[PDB]
Each structure stands twice: as C-alpha cells, then as structure tokens.
Design an enzyme around this catalytic site. Sequence first.
Site, PDB file in Angstrom:
ATOM      1  N   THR C 122     -56.398  55.742  30.395  1.00 37.93           N
ATOM      2  CA  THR C 122     -57.285  56.403  31.379  1.00 37.93           C
ATOM      3  C   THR C 122     -56.543  56.875  32.638  1.00 37.93           C
ATOM      4  O   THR C 122     -57.050  56.736  33.752  1.00 37.93           O
ATOM      5  CB  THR C 122     -58.466  55.500  31.825  1.00 37.93           C
ATOM      6  OG1 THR C 122     -57.978  54.399  32.600  1.00 37.93           O
ATOM      7  CG2 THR C 122     -59.247  54.982  30.645  1.00 37.93           C
ATOM      8  N   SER C 152     -55.886  62.750  34.366  1.00 36.21           N
ATOM      9  CA  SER C 152     -56.516  62.194  35.570  1.00 36.21           C
ATOM     10  C   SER C 152     -57.847  62.875  35.820  1.00 36.21           C
ATOM     11  O   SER C 152     -58.160  63.901  35.193  1.00 36.21           O
ATOM     12  CB  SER C 152     -55.605  62.342  36.781  1.00 36.21           C
ATOM     13  OG  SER C 152     -55.459  63.717  37.115  1.00 36.21           O
ATOM     14  N   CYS C 153     -58.637  62.297  36.732  1.00 35.18           N
ATOM     15  CA  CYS C 153     -59.889  62.905  37.140  1.00 35.18           C
ATOM     16  C   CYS C 153     -59.657  64.320  37.685  1.00 35.18           C
ATOM     17  O   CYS C 153     -60.409  65.249  37.367  1.00 35.18           O
ATOM     18  CB  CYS C 153     -60.624  62.021  38.153  1.00 35.18           C
ATOM     19  SG  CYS C 153     -59.659  61.597  39.606  1.00 35.18           S
ATOM     20  N   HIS C 180     -60.486  63.997  48.273  1.00 37.72           N
ATOM     21  CA  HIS C 180     -60.710  63.014  47.237  1.00 37.72           C
ATOM     22  C   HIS C 180     -61.200  61.691  47.823  1.00 37.72           C
ATOM     23  O   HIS C 180     -60.657  61.199  48.808  1.00 37.72           O
ATOM     24  CB  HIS C 180     -59.377  62.808  46.505  1.00 37.72           C
ATOM     25  CG  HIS C 180     -59.493  62.081  45.196  1.00 37.72           C
ATOM     26  ND1 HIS C 180     -59.946  60.782  45.098  1.00 37.72           N
ATOM     27  CD2 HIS C 180     -59.145  62.448  43.941  1.00 37.72           C
ATOM     28  CE1 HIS C 180     -59.918  60.395  43.836  1.00 37.72           C
ATOM     29  NE2 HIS C 180     -59.439  61.390  43.109  1.00 37.72           N
ATOM     30  N   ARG C 198     -50.971  55.399  51.469  1.00 39.51           N
ATOM     31  CA  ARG C 198     -52.009  54.572  50.848  1.00 39.51           C
ATOM     32  C   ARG C 198     -52.040  53.146  51.395  1.00 39.51           C
ATOM     33  O   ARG C 198     -52.951  52.378  51.087  1.00 39.51           O
ATOM     34  CB  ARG C 198     -51.859  54.545  49.309  1.00 39.51           C
ATOM     35  CG  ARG C 198     -52.183  55.885  48.647  1.00 39.51           C
ATOM     36  CD  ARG C 198     -52.140  55.819  47.134  1.00 39.51           C
ATOM     37  NE  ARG C 198     -52.365  57.133  46.514  1.00 39.51           N
ATOM     38  CZ  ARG C 198     -52.972  57.323  45.343  1.00 39.51           C
ATOM     39  NH1 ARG C 198     -53.442  56.288  44.643  1.00 39.51           N
ATOM     40  NH2 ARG C 198     -53.123  58.557  44.869  1.00 39.51           N
TER      41      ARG C 198
HETATM   42  N1  NAD Z   1     -61.304  55.439  40.084  1.00 45.59           N
HETATM   43  C1  NAD Z   1     -61.050  56.707  39.781  1.00 45.59           C
HETATM   44  O1  NAD Z   1     -61.554  57.698  40.524  1.00 45.59           O
HETATM   45  C2  NAD Z   1     -60.215  57.026  38.567  1.00 45.59           C
HETATM   46  C3  NAD Z   1     -60.428  58.232  37.890  1.00 45.59           C
HETATM   47  C4  NAD Z   1     -59.666  58.516  36.763  1.00 45.59           C
HETATM   48  C5  NAD Z   1     -58.715  57.585  36.340  1.00 45.59           C
HETATM   49  N2  NAD Z   1     -58.519  56.431  37.008  1.00 45.59           N
HETATM   50  C6  NAD Z   1     -57.505  55.524  36.483  1.00 45.59           C
HETATM   51  O2  NAD Z   1     -58.143  54.466  35.739  1.00 45.59           O
HETATM   52  C7  NAD Z   1     -57.404  53.247  35.904  1.00 45.59           C
HETATM   53  C8  NAD Z   1     -58.279  52.178  36.527  1.00 45.59           C
HETATM   54  O3  NAD Z   1     -58.732  52.629  37.807  1.00 45.59           O
HETATM   55  P1  NAD Z   1     -59.900  51.851  38.596  1.00 45.59           P
HETATM   56  O4  NAD Z   1     -60.179  52.690  39.823  1.00 45.59           O
HETATM   57  O5  NAD Z   1     -60.974  51.503  37.579  1.00 45.59           O
HETATM   58  O6  NAD Z   1     -59.111  50.507  39.029  1.00 45.59           O
HETATM   59  P2  NAD Z   1     -59.770  49.103  39.501  1.00 45.59           P
HETATM   60  O7  NAD Z   1     -58.722  48.489  40.392  1.00 45.59           O
HETATM   61  O8  NAD Z   1     -61.184  49.303  39.979  1.00 45.59           O
HETATM   62  O9  NAD Z   1     -59.831  48.322  38.105  1.00 45.59           O
HETATM   63  C9  NAD Z   1     -58.678  47.753  37.486  1.00 45.59           C
HETATM   64  C10 NAD Z   1     -59.183  46.591  36.639  1.00 45.59           C
HETATM   65  O10 NAD Z   1     -58.162  46.158  35.745  1.00 45.59           O
HETATM   66  C11 NAD Z   1     -57.991  44.744  35.866  1.00 45.59           C
HETATM   67  N3  NAD Z   1     -56.605  44.360  35.493  1.00 45.59           N
HETATM   68  C12 NAD Z   1     -55.478  44.454  36.237  1.00 45.59           C
HETATM   69  N4  NAD Z   1     -54.430  43.987  35.517  1.00 45.59           N
HETATM   70  C13 NAD Z   1     -54.912  43.614  34.309  1.00 45.59           C
HETATM   71  C14 NAD Z   1     -54.328  43.068  33.166  1.00 45.59           C
HETATM   72  N5  NAD Z   1     -52.995  42.823  33.116  1.00 45.59           N
HETATM   73  N6  NAD Z   1     -55.108  42.792  32.101  1.00 45.59           N
HETATM   74  C15 NAD Z   1     -56.443  43.025  32.114  1.00 45.59           C
HETATM   75  N7  NAD Z   1     -57.034  43.553  33.206  1.00 45.59           N
HETATM   76  C16 NAD Z   1     -56.286  43.847  34.308  1.00 45.59           C
HETATM   77  C17 NAD Z   1     -58.376  44.409  37.298  1.00 45.59           C
HETATM   78  O11 NAD Z   1     -58.821  43.053  37.440  1.00 45.59           O
HETATM   79  C18 NAD Z   1     -59.505  45.396  37.527  1.00 45.59           C
HETATM   80  O12 NAD Z   1     -60.757  44.850  37.105  1.00 45.59           O
HETATM   81  C19 NAD Z   1     -56.217  53.585  36.781  1.00 45.59           C
HETATM   82  O13 NAD Z   1     -55.144  53.885  35.872  1.00 45.59           O
HETATM   83  C20 NAD Z   1     -56.663  54.828  37.541  1.00 45.59           C
HETATM   84  O14 NAD Z   1     -55.580  55.646  37.984  1.00 45.59           O
HETATM   85  C21 NAD Z   1     -59.245  56.125  38.107  1.00 45.59           C
END
Ligand code: NAD
Lengths: 334, 334, 334, 334
Positions: C122, C152-153, C180, C198
């Site tokens: 993702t 990415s988004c 963003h 950041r």
């Molecule tokens: N939030 C957005 O707008 C967005 C949009 C598109 C893509 N993404 C991508 O999606 C991914 C997640 O983003 P998010 O915003 O949901 O992050 P987040 O920090 O909200 O969630 C990450 C989750 O993964 C868990 N985690 C961390 N290490 C782990 C491991 N080793 N094993 C199992 N779980 C683990 C954390 O506890 C957390 O619950 C990232 O790669 C981000 O770049 C984010």
Amino acid sequence: MKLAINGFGRIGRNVFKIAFERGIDIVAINDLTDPKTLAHLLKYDSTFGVYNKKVESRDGAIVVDGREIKIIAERDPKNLPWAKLGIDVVIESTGVFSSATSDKGGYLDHVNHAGAKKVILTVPAKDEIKTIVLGVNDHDINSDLKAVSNASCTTNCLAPLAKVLHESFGIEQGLMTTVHAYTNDQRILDLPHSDLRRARAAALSIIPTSTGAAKAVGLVLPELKGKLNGTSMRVPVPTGSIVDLTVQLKKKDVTKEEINSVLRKASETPELKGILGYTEDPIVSSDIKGNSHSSIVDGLETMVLENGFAKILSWYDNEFGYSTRVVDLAQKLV
Amino acid sequence: MKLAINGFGRIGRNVFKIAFERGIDIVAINDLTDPKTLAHLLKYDSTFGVYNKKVESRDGAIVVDGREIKIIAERDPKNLPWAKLGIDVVIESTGVFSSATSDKGGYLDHVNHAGAKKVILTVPAKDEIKTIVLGVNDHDINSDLKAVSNASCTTNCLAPLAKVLHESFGIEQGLMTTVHAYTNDQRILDLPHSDLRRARAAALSIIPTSTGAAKAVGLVLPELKGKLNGTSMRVPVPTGSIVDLTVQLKKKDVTKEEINSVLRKASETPELKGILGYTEDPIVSSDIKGNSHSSIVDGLETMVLENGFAKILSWYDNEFGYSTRVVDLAQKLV
Amino acid sequence: MKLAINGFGRIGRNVFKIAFERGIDIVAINDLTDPKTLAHLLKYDSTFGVYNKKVESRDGAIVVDGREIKIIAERDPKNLPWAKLGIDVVIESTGVFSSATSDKGGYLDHVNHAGAKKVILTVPAKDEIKTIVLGVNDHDINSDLKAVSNASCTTNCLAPLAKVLHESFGIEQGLMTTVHAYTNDQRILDLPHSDLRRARAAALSIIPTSTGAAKAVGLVLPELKGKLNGTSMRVPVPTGSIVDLTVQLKKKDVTKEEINSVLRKASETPELKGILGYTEDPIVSSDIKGNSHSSIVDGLETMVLENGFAKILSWYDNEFGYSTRVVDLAQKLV
Amino acid sequence: MKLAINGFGRIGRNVFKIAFERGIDIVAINDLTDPKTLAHLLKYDSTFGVYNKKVESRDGAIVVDGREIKIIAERDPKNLPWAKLGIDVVIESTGVFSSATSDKGGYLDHVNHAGAKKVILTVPAKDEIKTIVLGVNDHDINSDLKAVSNASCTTNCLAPLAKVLHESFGIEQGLMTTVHAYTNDQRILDLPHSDLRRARAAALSIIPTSTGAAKAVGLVLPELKGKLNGTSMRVPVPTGSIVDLTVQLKKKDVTKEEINSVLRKASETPELKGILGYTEDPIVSSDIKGNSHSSIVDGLETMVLENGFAKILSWYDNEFGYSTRVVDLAQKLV
Ligand SMILES: NC(=O)c1ccc[n+]([C@@H]2O[C@H](COP(=O)([O-])OP(=O)(O)OC[C@H]3O[C@@H](n4cnc5c(N)ncnc54)[C@H](O)[C@@H]3O)[C@@H](O)[C@H]2O)c1
Ligand SMILES: NC(=O)c1ccc[n+]([C@@H]2O[C@H](COP(=O)([O-])OP(=O)(O)OC[C@H]3O[C@@H](n4cnc5c(N)ncnc54)[C@H](O)[C@@H]3O)[C@@H](O)[C@H]2O)c1
Ligand SMILES: NC(=O)c1ccc[n+]([C@@H]2O[C@H](COP(=O)([O-])OP(=O)(O)OC[C@H]3O[C@@H](n4cnc5c(N)ncnc54)[C@H](O)[C@@H]3O)[C@@H](O)[C@H]2O)c1
Ligand SMILES: NC(=O)c1ccc[n+]([C@@H]2O[C@H](COP(=O)([O-])OP(=O)(O)OC[C@H]3O[C@@H](n4cnc5c(N)ncnc54)[C@H](O)[C@@H]3O)[C@@H](O)[C@H]2O)c1
C-alpha cells in the site's frame, strides 16, 4: 555546575535554553539521533519560535554561540559517560525512565552506574523518591540528595495554589480538572496507545485522561494527603494549560474577594514571587505561552458559593514554567 | 404543523434537517442572504458532511428532494409574513433577538405583529421567558404557550444530570465547567467583541467565558435554584462539548459505582431515553459528533472523594443534541 | 477470497471496512497490539465517526456483527501463518516493509515464507515491483502476479488526470504540488524525524516535504517518464488533499472550457467512472472526506494561459479513495 | 510625520507596533469600538504574543509607554478630523473602503474631505490606484502622490521574486498558488459570505479562493503584464503563507542551483535586502511568523524540469512582512 540532559525533547530543549541563558555549563546532551537533528530542533521551535543564538552542528556535538555541547546517542543510561565528563546534575527528561532501576534502565542509573552526582527526574516517579515543588517544600532540599523528582507540570500549578488556600482558609477536600495542551505522549491521528483515549487524534478532540497530579500534592503537602483528586482533558492547543480547582474550605463565610485577596498577596511574597502569579486581565491560553510562573491565578474567574464551596482557575505554560522550575531546582541542589 | 425558521445558521440548518426528516411542513426560512447561499450551506456542511438530498435554489426559494421552502430576507421580524403563511411554530435561531422586544425587534415580534402561533427561542432569554428542558420539566408545556426558550445546550446537558442526582441522592450545592466547542459567536483571529475573551482567535486558545447555564437549571428544577453555578472554557474543536460537574451530594456514603448505577438506570427509562445517555467506553469528543442526546454520562470519569463530594462528566454535541430538542419541543407545542 | 491485513492503521482499518461491506472474507489482522485496542480503534474513528456495527474483542480475535477475525501480533512477517490460514491476498499496510526483502523483513515475506498467494503493497516500493493504478494501467493485471504496489494516494489522484490530459492534448511536461493532510508519519509536536520538515508539529504549520508521486506516474504511464515532478505541502487537516497540476500541453490554443469538457466526459466513461470525478460546485476539503474517487477535478479552479500553459486542481481523500482502490485491486487480482 | 490608522485590525495593529518602534508620531486610531477594547487587543495578541509595553486606555484615547493616541469611532471616513489633527499619512486598513468613493464612502475620503495629505490603502483597490511594491517599483514614488495601494501580501511576495527571475532569465509565462493562512475575512464555522468557499469553517479545510495577486504583478512590473496568473488555498494556520511559482523561463538550460544563486545574490543587494530573503534551512510556516521580509525563497524546494520550466517557493508572514512594507512606504511618501 556541570549539567547533562538526557532526552533532548520538549522539556530537555526548554531546560537547555533557560540553563544556557543563566551561564550554566551544559556539558552534554543524550538522545537517540544525530547532532544535525538536535541542532535543527533547537534552532526552530514550532511552539516558541526561532532561537536567537548562532547554532551549528558538528561530529558528536552542537555549537551554541561558540559553546560546544557533546552529543551522545546511548539508549542505555547505565552506559553514559557522566563520571568522565564530571557531571554534577543530569536532567532525566526522556519520559521512559521513571523507575529507579529496571531491566531496560532507570533514573538512578545516571548516578549509580554512569557516575553523575545528581539526577532530576522531570516527571513523577513510579516508585518512592524525594519530590520537590518549588515554593511548596523547598526546605526539603538538602545537599546529600542524589535523586529528586520535580513532580508534574500540573502538580506544580496545583500545589502552590493549594498551599495558600489551605494555610489561609483550610481545605477540607478538593476536586480538579486540568484543561491541558496536547503533548508528544499523544497521537497525531488514531493509533495504538496503552491509554485508549490518548490513542486518538490529538488536534481533533477534547480527550479525557487520568492524572495523579492532584493526589501527588499529598507528597509535597502531607496535610493534604488523601484530600485532592482530579482528572485531565487534553485539548487541541500546543502549550498552555489551566487548573480548575473546586474546593471545600473550612471558612464557611469565605468570599470571592477574600480568596482573590489572599492569592494576590501570596503572589507578592518572596517565597512565591515568580512561582505563583495573579492577574485580573481577561486573558486566554496563548497569553501565557512562555510564562515562567508555575501557577497564575485568573482572578476574574474565581467563583464562590455558600459555605466555603469555591472554584479557582490557574494558568500555566506546562512546558515553560515547569522547565524554569527544573533549572531553578538544579541550581538549588548545588 | 407549519414550521418557519428565523436564522438559517448552525442551529437553524440542523433543526431544518431534523424536522425535514420527520415530515414536518417547513414553510419558510428567513435569513439575510440569497437562496443560492442558503442552499449551498445546507448542502455542504463542514462539521457534518454532505447532505444526502437533492438541493436546488430558485428565485425566493430552495427545494429539498422536490419540496419547496420559501426564502425570505427580512431583518426586522415584525415584518415577517407568518399569519399569511399559516405558521404554527417559528424557530428563532438568529442569535440577535434574545429580548422580547427592543427598538430593533425581539422574539415576541414573531407571535405579535408577524402572527405566528408560537415561537421557540433557541437561547436563554435576556429577560424572562417560559423555559423548557425536555426530560426535566415537560409537564410545564401546555397548549396556551406562545413563546418558550429551549434554554442553552449546556443547560440541556446539565439539568437532566442534576435531575437524576438530586432525586437519587439530594444535591446540596455544585459548581461546573463546560469544556465547549467554539461557535460563530467567536472570532477567527483577534477582533473586537463585547466579551474580551471571545474577541480572541478561537482555534488558538483555551478561552474562559461566563455562562448562566448552571444557574438556569433552577428555572426547570426549582429545588436546585441557587444551588448551582459555573464557567465555560471554549477550546479549539468545531462541535462537541463536555460538562464537568463537581457536586456535594446529601448521601454521605455515596460511591462512584452507585452514581453510575442510577445514571445508567435513568438513561434506560421512557422519560429520559434519547435525552440522557450513559457510556463506559473511553471516548473522546469527536465520538459524540451527531449524537442526538442532550447529555451522555462518561461513566469511566465518575469520581467521588469523601462524604458525598463527587465529580461527574457528561458529553453533548452542542449543535446536534440541542437542535433535536428544538424539533422535539416544537412537536410537543402543537 | 480470503484476505489478511498486515498493519491495522489508517489504511488497514479503512480497507477492512470497505472489504467487510463487500462480503470479502477477512480471515486475520496482524499488528503490534491486543484485540481490545484494535476493536476500539475500529469502533471509534476520529476522522470518519462511529463504526455502526457490533464490535467485540476476545482472546486472539475481534468480532464484527458476529463474524470473527483472528488477531495476530507478529513483528516479523516471515513468521505469519498465511499458508495455514489459506490467505489469497495480504494487504501490506504497516509502512515499514517497502522493500521486497530486508534484514528486518519485506513485502515478499508474505508470499515466499509466510505462504500467502499474493501481496498488495500500500505504498510505492523502494525497489522494482509491478505497480498498478486503477483507471490507468488495469490491463497490466495478470493472474500470475505475486506482489503489486497500488502506488501512493497522490499518484492515484495524479495519474488518471495525466492520462486524460496526455491522451486529449499531449503533455510536454508538468510540475505539481499536493496540498496534503497530515498523516501518522508526522509529529504532534516537534520531535526527531529522519525528515527534518516532518519533525515539526503537524497541526501548527504548512510543511513542505518531498514526493516521488509525480515521477511515479512514469511507472504506470511510460510515455510520461521523466516528464513530471513535484512537491508536497502537509497542512493541518486530518484527511483530504488536493493536486495542483501545472502543465505545458501540446495543443497551443487549448482553453479552460476544452480542458474541463474532456475531464467531465472522461469521468463518465466506463474506464474511469468512480475513479475520476468532476465537479463545478465550490467545495472545500471537508466535502471530499469519505469520497471513494481517486481524483475529483475542481472545474471552477481550471486556469489556462496562452500556448497550452494550464493549471488543473483535483481533490482526493488520501485515506478513503486510496483504500477503496486497494480493495478494488484485491478483487481484480483473484 | 503624523500618522493616522483607519481600521485597527490585524494589519492596523501590526502597522501601529512597527511605526511606534520607529518613533513615528501616531496621532489617532479610528475603529468601531471603545478604547478599552483596542488597548486590550493591542496588549494581547494571539498570534504574536504579549506586547512588551505599558498599555492603558482612557476616555477617547489609549496610552502606549506614556505616548497618548486619540481614539475615534467614526464609520464614515468623510467625517474624520484629519486636517485638524495635521495628519500626513492615513493607513486605510478597514478592508471595507477599497473603492475611491461610493454611497458609503471610500479611500479618497481620507484625502479629499477629511483632509489628510496622503492615504495608503492596505489592499489592492477595486478601481485603479497607484500601486507600489517596495523593492520593485520604488522609483514610481514621488511627492505628488495623494493615494497609493501597497498591493496585497501575496503580490509583495511574488513580485520581488518575479523581478529577479525576469531580469536574470526572462519569464515567458507563469502560474502560481499561494498556500495561505486564514484571515478575518473567513468564517469560524459555515456562515454566509459572498464567496461560497470563504463561507466555510476556516480551521477545518483547505479552501480554494481566487486571487488577483499574480496578475497584479503587471502593475508594478509592466514587462510581466498578462504573463502571470494564480489561485489561493486558505489553510488552517493563523499566519504564515507560501507562494508556489511555476514559471517557464527564457533561459532554456537554467538549473536549480543557478536559480538559487541569483535569488541568494539578489537578497543581499541594497535594493532587495530586507525585502527578498533566502534560506536553505528546511523550515516550516511557523518559522516565518514575525519575519519582516516580503518574500523568503525556500532554496531546498527550487525545482527545474526541462527547458527552463521551473518551480520556486517563497515564504511570507502575510501580516507582518506586509505591515512592515506599509510603514516603510509611509516613510518614503513623506
Ligand atoms: N494515510 C494515508 O493518507 C496513506 C495513503 C496511501 C498510502 N499510505 C501508506 O500506507 C501505509 C500505512 O499508512 P498509515 O497512514 O495507515 O500508517 P499508520 O501509522 O496509521 O498505521 C501503521 C500500522 O502498522 C502497524 N505496524 C507497524 N509495524 C508493524 C509490524 N512490523 N507488523 C505489523 N504491524 C505493524 C502499526 O502498529 C500501525 O497500526 C504506509 O506505507 C503509507 O505510506 C498511507
Ligand atoms: N511536555 C510537557 O508539558 C511536560 C511537562 C512536565 C513534565 N513532562 C515530562 O517530561 C518528560 C519528557 O516530556 P517531553 O514532552 O519533553 O517528551 P518528548 O517526547 O518531547 O521528548 C522525549 C525525548 O527523549 C528522547 N528519548 C527517548 N528515549 C530515550 C532514551 N532511551 N535515551 C535517550 N533519549 C531518549 C526522545 O528521542 C525525545 O527527544 C516526560 O516524562 C513528561 O511526562 C512533560
Ligand atoms: N451553536 C451552538 O452550539 C448553539 C447551541 C445552542 C443554542 N445556540 C443559540 O442559537 C442561536 C443561533 O446560533 P448559531 O450558532 O446557529 O449562530 P450562527 O451565527 O451560526 O447563525 C445565525 C444565523 O442567523 C442569521 N441572522 C442574523 N441576523 C438575522 C436577522 N436579523 N434576520 C434573519 N436572520 C439573521 C445569520 O445570517 C445566520 O445565518 C444563538 O442564539 C445561539 O446562542 C447555539
Ligand atoms: N490579514 C492579512 O494577511 C492582510 C495582508 C495584507 C493586506 N490585508 C488587507 O488589510 C485590510 C485589513 O485586513 P485585516 O486582516 O487587518 O482585517 P481585520 O478584520 O482584522 O481588521 C479590520 C478592522 O477595521 C475595523 N473597521 C471595519 N469597518 C470600519 C469602518 N467603517 N471604520 C473604521 N474601522 C472599521 C474593524 O473593526 C477591524 O478592527 C484588508 O483590506 C485586507 O485585505 C490583510
């Protein structure tokens, strides 16, 4: 005095600036990152603005107006070079070492293994420790102390206020709320946390969270042990908080004016000047940012019903007032 | 029943959405702008989201899922065509007519020269008016009423809470604080205001402000007259608020579990279901957004010190819960 | 199909909700905490509201409307029981496994060692991977795929827009900015971060940060390799973002009306319906919260100078639109 | 020089403080309120902090560190006593008199009937007015000027930037976005506004809004007339903005380092020092709060695609930089 700071975060960095300004010899900083990151965070503060000194980073050091401060990146406090560096006082402001000793480490490690003379813990201890709130139990400081807690920002606001009210009118009991800026213990968006409320997006909500700060007044004012409790509401401001104290007083004909009068007078005494403040201006939390007082009574807000039932509101910059106290305390320990 | 809305703002539009969903005949809306602007504000709500209805504007009207609602732009309510339109209940939600009359009009203009049968003032009156808080003094409603205030959002949160506590345990005295969402009465950045605290940038600070809402409990629960007072802290959230009541109860051996017990029980009764809610989930303000209850006790926060001295916290969506009450009250009036 | 979610965060939980609603069999969730925490975070979402389903937790499971989903807490993805559980598609949404393999782990661990059939990453991969943007390069989906990035988004917003403009007018080159929402990669108050921008209090500032999202369009539209670049500005909103695309088009007499006309027409085609939207309503970011499109052209904002020099703005809910695409993609893979 | 300020708002009060420090005789302030409110707003600024001077109010006046300033409350500027008070320069900062005249007054009332010698309009005029951007068309200032506009904060950022780029490289065309702090022209919660986007809760969204600031560059740089345009995005920060300029340059082999070098060098010249700034620190918007530059190039952000197609970002405190220019301009006019 030779100072070291363990954990160069919100408290660590404000302590640095206040101590540096006083001519204290800040020998070393320990954190988990490189000098460039630490120098950059020191120079540019989102809450307080741009640091007016010349700040550089070098290999293993930051430089502030030409004074070089060593940077360490050592996770285990047992491994810190404090004896080598002749450290008089370590400021323990990582947030993660609030027990004396532990498997992962503890605040006493700074003195017992690492070789520093003294440690100030910038949070209530999870175990027994000498706890000082300046303006409250200053007399409890002696030269033989190895470890001291400066309590919490909220206890520092509440205890001086409670001291004056108890001495003047007698407190039978009190309940409180702190409406309190968010901190780095919280989350930017919903994310796991052991406290399910603190798990929640910090700038989006009023967030109830428990506090031991009112119970902790009993550590510094033993007559009030068991007499105070309260709660906290984390709200979306970056710094600035307010204690909202509801007390039952022994003086059953007490008035608003009598309460405000003793609080005003107390703020002008040598024991509490610069610690307890008093105002009658209609201010808001932004107006107290960067204020060095522990507790500033909002006199316009004082509210009194019959039979000694009263509410007192007192402002504090939870970062800056508290950090000033930490430095004040360091200087008193020596 | 024929409803008109005077002042299509945060309260007016929520009242509109709630009433429309119930099939109430909303005949006309009066404001100070054009139908395109009102249609747009109705359709797109920053706080509650996009309205899932077809919204159209035309000359002198808006259309919501094929239902036409007349749009008027008359500043002086004495000039409103309520008799001609057959209006049974006018919702007075402009914020600027909280006196019965004045040289610029007042809420009675709706039922005197404009000729509506009845008016609900969506704010406490500056002068004296019949005041109703549903779940508390429903009995005071009779078909002869012309003008009523639904009180304030905060009184609607506090009074049901006070009712139950008083009936179960007896209330000696209490003081409260509401930690309260900002409203359109505040300022986006510092700007003149008759209240020098409300003058201040609303999203930047915790902002103390006075409230009559605890004293007002006495209007609807006469036994509690003179027994309650409090203050308000406006904080940077767009909706969602919490009452923090500190109360001396007459039952001296009362426990927190007992308090939660009667409140939870009361929440399940026909008299208070939909009005008083109860939870033990560790929630935050964003979670009560769009909740239609007047008062939602946060069971985890209940706290008792000694001898009946107790603290109780209750959530409310200050816009949405209150707006539901306004519609409920309008229906009861006819 | 049998789905597993690795990393139950913003993306993970939104993917869960979207998938669950579609009747997809969500077999297990892996994260770093207990089922009570995960259930609580699913139930109460600060951004999107209260999940209206019966959510429960037990030993090693959460239950949603009676359907049990297994909870695992395994940091190393090599150790996950995907083969035993029959997992068709793993959603890799921890954010920490964006290389195929590594010392600590990588996305391919889900298939090569843990025994799932397929993994969706993702986020853009740090290495070479099949990269799919729905509406752009769907035909590249073949049944033998084991590992795919949904990009990415911002690439999901930008790529369908670029495709339409390039096909209709030809893009010589383009620069862009995304304004963003903040994300969990940011900090609530100033705190160490590998990216020094950041590191800063996310709800307090406009925060420039690098993005590869414009270069990445070249992965899914090879004709536009080396033709696009850009930057990001993280600002204090919890979700909702907008692409601001400035392009030099090959049609040197192109007009605003022509640009808007092709975008409106494209948004109605089978290929792009539900992916690319078009509006002429004067909306703001809150209005796209919870919108399932990848890209919604703000038609009122289109601006054109002479010689094909044009600016196009397109909205996206960076969490919800992207999460909807992740689930669409999962269903296409099987 | 005798200065009067009409509209003691965000710009008026910042102008006051800057002028005061320079020893300018501030004779009178006109607004719509009483001296206590103006003194209070002057003393306590949510954005910039507590004013470090003694501020007192009295009948018809405020006093600042012993200096008395007359307070007037006159809605129609034709009635202002500017001749009698000997006013050299009026600062027209109410925001409601951007036309020369109307049936409700206009900026020329200050110099025609009211009898001030000169007026500076702190906004672009809705009609034609001599417009000056310091650092750009200083030579256009002469002693015969009666009425001038200092343009907008955005034009003051963009114009010096465009000047240097055009002089060094030639500008073919350019398009821009400003990502911009909210102002008092916006709404705290959704409320009627003639601009349907500015009607929306200001701290809750990214809000597109039109701007004439890029086209206005042509007023002060005639060679760039018709060559620039742009749009604005209002975001939830109280001050601090950034211009994002995408420009097609005439030098087709220009590089990022070359652009940065001319911008850095220009910022050191006597003509642009203090007006155009340059940094290579990875800053965020909070860091330019209180900065007196019109335009601060973010050198790390400078980007070049192919063939002279380039992107430049420049910070500005929309309140404080602009207000400093207003005072600079006032002094140049006399
Ligand atoms: N939030 C957005 O707008 C967005 C949009 C598109 C893509 N993404 C991508 O999606 C991914 C997640 O983003 P998010 O915003 O949901 O992050 P987040 O920090 O909200 O969630 C990450 C989750 O993964 C868990 N985690 C961390 N290490 C782990 C491991 N080793 N094993 C199992 N779980 C683990 C954390 O506890 C957390 O619950 C990232 O790669 C981000 O770049 C984010
Ligand atoms: N922020 C406040 O309002 C406030 C007020 C009074 C007391 N406190 C207390 O002070 C302490 C620090 O609070 P803060 O807000 O500055 O936290 P913070 O998160 O801003 O800073 C913590 C710092 O310690 C560093 N750190 C973490 N683990 C470390 C380790 N093992 N070794 C060395 N460095 C490590 C982190 O990198 C970070 O720089 C906490 O105990 C807190 O409860 C905070
Ligand atoms: N927002 C809350 O949480 C809340 C809760 C309970 C009660 N109230 C009360 O309800 C009332 C409205 O509050 P709000 O928050 O909706 O205010 P608001 O400012 O959002 O809306 C006021 C509306 O009335 C219109 N208006 C002003 N003067 C008018 C006139 N002379 N004729 C017709 N329309 C006019 C305005 O254009 C605006 O649309 C206030 O009395 C307030 O105290 C507010
Ligand atoms: N805020 C900015 O970033 C910024 C930057 C550059 C220019 N400007 C321009 O400066 C002007 C002022 O902007 P601001 O943000 O200070 O506005 P503001 O709303 O903060 O202040 C306006 C002040 O003028 C007063 N006022 C209104 N009508 C009046 C009248 N008829 N007579 C006397 N006083 C009156 C109001 O009471 C208020 O105190 C506007 O034209 C704006 O476009 C603003």
